[PDB]
């Protein structure tokens, strides 16, 4: 029942000064059959979240190497543990970081996805300390591989606890793989941050700090929800122009501001009476933008939704104290607050509307005739092609790199 | 006091000459002096103050908090008084009304007011200039050289004065709902009590059966305990290093107490709080009322991820004017808000709070915070502006006494 397949292994953290070649390799791994309520999933593609690059740099993994990378991806159920309910072999699933038990006081509040019973699997292991992944090293020893959290997506086959899975095939049978892959993290996060957490209403103003794939998904949501004003802030003019094309109304290049004008000052100057924005979204990973987004919000009334991640000194972020006391309102957000049972089905339906699909196509640079994305690499084409693709994640026009894992 | 023929009142006020920086004394910067108080203009109230009461933010103001250029000033934002006169444009107030005038007004028409969920009014926000909008001040003094000099406010007014002037858009009346309320209770309703009570009642929206953590049980945190008890919280966990105020908190409804200076080896305040909750899930509502930057982060971490709100009331003079949060715990369900005056809106919420303050258990708790003696109308720690600068300097040092919860500054006969 053991599958042998290709996976992207991280040997150790890539610390500053080290290369991708030093730590990243495509290898053959062994994937054990699923136990209990687990799904073993034939992956179609992964797509590269900035958090995947932070993971390569050791984020949230002080001991959890070697590992198979990745949390953003989509695939098809190949087999299931004997206790599984509510899934079938052949279902198309995504498996984000947080499940939804629907019975804990967090689920029952109706206002959060931080489920007390199906929270983030920070151990990067099965609950017994084992892993469904292993490999045979050059010494010929069988060695354990850690997951990312509850699973790894940079692999032709993964195993995940079905309490974290949600299916695509009943609502969206024709959804292309790359779209399913960004729905598993990037698109849910940006869209949800605006729709659910900031709770943007028709006529609200929105500021979005960082228009990578997450920020652009937030623009798409703000436009869909008929925000009066959608302000985008970034150093990347290509991605600012893409945000404007998908509905942003005002753009600010933060690296072209005068030295004495902060990003929050620049945002506030666009709003009437310098009052700030109804909803402030941070989607950059830049600790400075977390404090700027907090400042750009209308004091008291508006919520600042922090989605960014990064490797911060002492794992700490900072806020300017006076501006925080006098009306700051900041929340941490994982996966857009999009609960896998209560919210994700509705987001999946929305994603199929033509303007939403067009925006996802633009994020991906998707060609529906060829099913190819602008920036794509196939796990079957070897380690050198992958290392080059990982470097090209920093290209100005690379919004979302796709890793193809199997035939579609 | 009686105005001169030009309407100017001469009275006592507590002047701050400059910031009391580290190593400086209260004697270096704090003096009771005679000041002139101009007549009110426009929609202003000129108010005969009954008493001020000492908020930790008053002491921060003495240390220069939020006042890089706004010295010399008259201190104080917590206090109560009686309208003596009004500007010609004033609406909805009478001479003789008893008022308090906190930092935020409530226009009722801006998008923040109409949200129903904040007190941060866009039209009547904090007056950080510590001046009138034209750059004048209603306060001046004659210095030792014989020259008339300007005095800054705290924000929109100063309370440490026998007579204050404030824009009536920041005032709310006590005498219709609570005519018998004593002055020091009115004073703590203007800041300390509203802040702790409102942080629990309005901002954290504590429900019957919720668990609550309160970091710092000074007057603000003890007011939070009183609210959490009134709202029938299941669990009220208080954290501090002052054993006297932890014990007062327990007497007024706290269920568990933690001494942050006596924790086991390897245990943070947030861990200590979570250890008292089922499966170490933390609390439904986390209140910070200490001014200790460490406790703002511990309060964030004690809250149930995602579900709970952490309400930050604390103030201080911090390294690089910033505070910090542990990033992984913050991203994975942190929820932190800045709170001024408990989110208690002066028109929409204050009347209800003033009615609650008259209920017997709530009044008993206010009496305990103040150490109030109804027979003498005197508080346990009280100093009178009419009795000289030396007595004031001693009282300011005695703010640090373990059993000083709320120092009252009497300003006028009651
Ligand atoms: N909370 C979650 O569930 C969640 C989900 C998705 C991604 N993330 C995090 O959210 C962030 C956004 O994800 P992404 O994949 O879109 O990342 P990304 O790297 O693709 O895009 C980030 C954008 O922010 C901009 N930015 C970063 N630093 C900047 C600076 N110094 N000046 C100006 N602009 C700056 C970049 O130019 C870029 O356009 C990342 O930090 C990622 O790790 C978190
Ligand atoms: N946001 C507002 O509207 C508002 C209103 C009132 C007060 N404040 C601020 O809120 C805080 C509470 O005000 P207060 O007048 O009750 O203050 P206070 O100083 O009388 O009481 C603070 C309490 O916190 C405890 N604390 C402080 N540092 C500590 C440490 N290192 N370890 C353990 N415990 C510690 C103290 O021992 C004390 O019991 C202050 O910072 C004050 O400046 C703000
Ligand atoms: Mg398992
Ligand atoms: Mg005025
Ligand atoms: Zn991600
Ligand atoms: Zn749950
Ligand atoms: Zn105060
Ligand atoms: Zn208003």
Residue numbers in the entry:
A (entry chain A): 15 to 422
B (entry chain B): 9 to 422
Authors' account:
This enzyme strictly conserves the substrate- and NAD(H)-binding domains of Zn2+-containing alcohol dehydrogenase (ADH); however, there is no evidence suggesting that LuHNL possesses ADH activity. Herein, we determined the ligand-free 3D structure of LuHNL and its complex with acetone cyanohydrin and (R)-2-butanone cyanohydrin using X-ray crystallography.
Because of the low sequence identity of LuHNL with structures of known proteins, the initial structure model of ligand-free LuHNL (LuHNL_lig_free) was built using the BALBES program. The crystal belongs to the monoclinic space group P21 with unit-cell parameters a = 94.12 Å, b = 52.18, c = 168.51; α = 90.00, β = 95.01, γ = 90.00. The Rwork and Rfree values of the refined coordinate are 0.156 and 0.183 at 1.48 Å as shown in Table S1 (Section 1). The electron density of NAD+ was observed in the crystal without the addition of exogenous NAD+ during enzyme crystallization or soaking of the crystal in an NAD+ solution before X-ray diffraction. The NAD+ molecule was bound to the β11α6β12 fold, a classic binding domain for ADP, which is consistent with the fingerprint for ADP binding that identified from the amino acid sequence of LuHNL. Furthermore, two classical tetra-coordinated complexes of Zn2+ ions were observed. One was bonded to Cys115, Cys118, Cys121, and Cys 129 at a distance of 2.3 to 2.4 Å, and the second Zn2+ complex formed bonds with Cys63, His85, Cys199, and one molecule of water at a distance of 2.0 to 2.4 Å. Beyond the water molecule that bonded to the second Zn2+ ion, a glycerol molecule was trapped via hydrogen bond interaction with the water molecule and residues of Thr111, Lys162, Glu323, and Thr349, which implies that the second Zn2+ area is the catalytic site of LuHNL. In addition, a hexa-coordinated complex of Mg2+ ion was observed on the enzyme surface that bonded with residues of Glu52, Glu140, and four molecules of water at 2.0 to 2.2 Å. In addition, the binding geometry of glycerol, a pseudosubstrate that bound in the catalytic pocket of ligand-free LuHNL structure (LuHNL-lig-free) suggests that a hydroxyl group cannot replace the water molecule to bond with catalytic Zn2+, even in the absence of a nitrile group.
